[PDB]
Enzyme design. Sequence first.
Site: not given
Length: 165
Positions: A126-127, A153, A95, A118
Amino acid sequence: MVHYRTIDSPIGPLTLAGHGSVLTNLRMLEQTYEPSLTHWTPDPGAFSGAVDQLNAYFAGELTEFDVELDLRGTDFQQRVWKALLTIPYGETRSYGEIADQIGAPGAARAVGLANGHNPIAIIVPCHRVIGASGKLTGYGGGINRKRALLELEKSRAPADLTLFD
């Protein structure tokens, strides 16, 4: 008006909404309160390009999205969602790092709250953002959806197996 379509996925029933062929919304809505849902027309054939991309994405064939969006939010939110879209598949940011990228050093906590709002999940990623502690966030089971998405991912097999030949 604004019309919407619902499709299934490994992390739950994703709902896509927006005017024409433009996404304004994408959220797993199952078992939460969505006020503006009543002001929406159902259309089981819209955003046809998008669903393909999603189903491809969940299959591991897709790495980058080509979809048109209209993010609506405060100016600050705009800038945070701009930065978000610059984190590539398989990566993460803190962040704090985002707070620097948008030119307000120290605003870690504000990004986190701006991440919560979001409008478009997955595509605006956002993940792919995590605090220093590694603890993930989200109510509604949203933590597991983030975790699942992060696992998927990272488990990406190297693309061409011919580089090993």
